[PDB]
Design a protein around this nucleic acid. Structure first.
Ligand SMILES: Nc1ncnc2c1ncn2[C@H]1C[C@H](O)[C@@H](COP(=O)(O)NP(=O)(O)OP(=O)(O)O)O1
Ligand SMILES: [Mg+2]
Ligand SMILES: [Mg+2]
Length: 430
DNA sequence: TGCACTGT
DNA sequence: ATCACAGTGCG
């Protein structure tokens, strides 16, 4: 009677299907419905792949592949390459396309921009509004034309995917308690209806397709989204969690894909998320800390309270470039010119941001990597950002890293710099 | 504050 | 020779 079940919210996670590919496919119809990928640069092995159409994924093409190697799996692979500006890749087209989608989503509910192509949605309020709009009318299956119900169909009493989807949807609806407006299952269902409408508005108004997950928290919504990609949405009810987690690898839950998740596996000697239920909260806290332990004890039961943050804009605006192998920057003149290229794109983006969103960045973060450093960043320094001036930002950034040159020869730079990073942070209203 | 960690 | 980003938590 007093055991909480984590069914107080309706949360959704929307994620664009092969987003960068869709952006290029909208612009160039010749790429539509083909095996294609978006590539970065072209000189080193045809460029690095950062996005792959589902037609190409069937040949085994993946993100991070070199295009020359992808061509070995998919000889007819088509390629759109990222725009290059001031010597570097420039992602403006995709950031702007992202804004298109985010603004549409914001018409239905407050969203948390989680990445360039996905956003969390708190639908608890909209669900209640819709629950009263209908005078206890049953939810027709025609309002959920692309929804999957995780765990269904099941039980006693065809062999195509869409047939299965309908089967599971019918079982779900036929047992829904439509008279109880407080039923969590009914609230998820209404949430799914709204997400159907949200995804329809996105495709109508931008041409982009997406998938979504609907559940009671962000981790389940995220996990649900990926169960039936692309162009489908999945509803993960509280009751579906025991079976879903019983065979769910720990690394699949958000925040457990790295070192922490591996230590959970190595220390506890378990494989699946569900196995965590057999440990006490104090046990999990003793191994992984007070916060992580409490989070794991609740999460393996499908409970999580991370709120959907009202944040439609990114908190930072950054610009970087790697200088691999022999292209490392070994002269103060080289560092001077590239710091200026970055500063110029940053000024461009910062001026636009200030005009569009009534805010100004107040701190400039400068980071570099040094050739041979095992880590991806070696130094991070911040300085005041008093003016949107590329030459000042680039001059200041040089000043804050300058002390890092171990070459008495003023013109030389050692060790060579393999990365430059400028980031505008600490925004204030303007 | 600077970095490790986690993610797209 | 992945690369270009972006958010969170620790001491
Ligand atoms: N490591 C990386 N480097 C550069 N760009 C990247 C990247 N990872 C992602 N992007 C860019 C490229 C992506 O288009 C976009 C969204 O990332 P996802 O949602 O993780 N992958 P997608 O949406 O393409 O396919 P689907 O969602 O259907 O699985 O961010
Ligand atoms: Mg995506
Ligand atoms: Mg995504």
């Amino acid at each position: 009677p007093h055991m909480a079940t984590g069914q107080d919210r309706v949360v959704a996670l929307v994620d664009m299907d092969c987003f960068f590919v869709q952006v290029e496919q909208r612009q160039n119809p010749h790429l539509r419905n083909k095996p294609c990928a978006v590539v970065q640069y072209k000189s080193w092995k045809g460029g690095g792949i950062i996005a792959v159409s589902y037609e190409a994924r069937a040949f085994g093409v993946t993100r991070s592949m070199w295009a020359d190697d992808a061509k070995k799996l998919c000889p007819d692979l088509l390629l759109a390459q990222v725009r290059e500006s001031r010597g570097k890749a420039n992602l403006t087209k995709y950031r702007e396309a992202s804004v298109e989608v985010m603004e549409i989503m914001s018409r239905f509910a407050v969203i948390e921009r989680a990445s360039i192509d996905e956003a969390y949605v708190d639908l608890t309020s909209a669900v209640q509004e819709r629950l009263q709009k209908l005078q206890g009318q049953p939810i027709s299956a025609d309002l959920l034309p692309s929804t999957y119900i995780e765990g269904l169909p099941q039980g006693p009493t065809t062999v195509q995917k869409e047939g299965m989807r309908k089967q599971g949807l019918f079982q779900w609806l036929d047992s829904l308690q439509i008279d109880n407006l407080t039923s969590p299952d009914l609230q998820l269902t209404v949430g799914a209806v709204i997400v159907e409408e949200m995804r329809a508005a996105i495709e109508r108004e931008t041409g982009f397709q997406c998938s979504a997950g609907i559940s009671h928290n962000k981790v389940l919504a995220k996990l649900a989204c990926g169960l039936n990609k692309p162009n489908r949405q999945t509803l993960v009810s509280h009751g579906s969690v025991p079976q879903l987690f019983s065979q769910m690898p720990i690394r699949k839950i958000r925040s457990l894909g790295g070192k922490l998740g591996a230590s959970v596996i190595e220390i506890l000697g378990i494989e699946y998320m569900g196995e965590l239920t057999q440990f006490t909260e104090s046990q999990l806290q003793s191994h992984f800390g007070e916060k992580n332990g409490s989070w794991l004890y609740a999460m393996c039961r499908g409970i999580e309270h991370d709120p959907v943050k009202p944040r439609q804009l990114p908190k930072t605006i950054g610009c970087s470039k790697n200088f691999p192998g022999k292209t490392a920057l070994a002269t103060r003149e080289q560092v001077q010119w590239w710091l200026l290229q970055l500063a110029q794109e940053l000024e461009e983006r910062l001026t636009k941001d200030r005009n569009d969103n009534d805010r100004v960045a107040t701190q400039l973060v400068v980071s570099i990597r040094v050739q041979g450093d095992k880590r991806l960043s070696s130094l991070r320094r911040c300085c005041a950002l008093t003016r949107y001036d590329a030459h000042k930002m680039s001059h200041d950034a040089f000043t804050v890293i300058k002390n890092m040159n171990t070459s008495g020869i003023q013109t030389e730079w050692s060790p060579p710099l393999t990365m430059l990073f400028l980031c505008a942070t600490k925004f204030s209203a303007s």
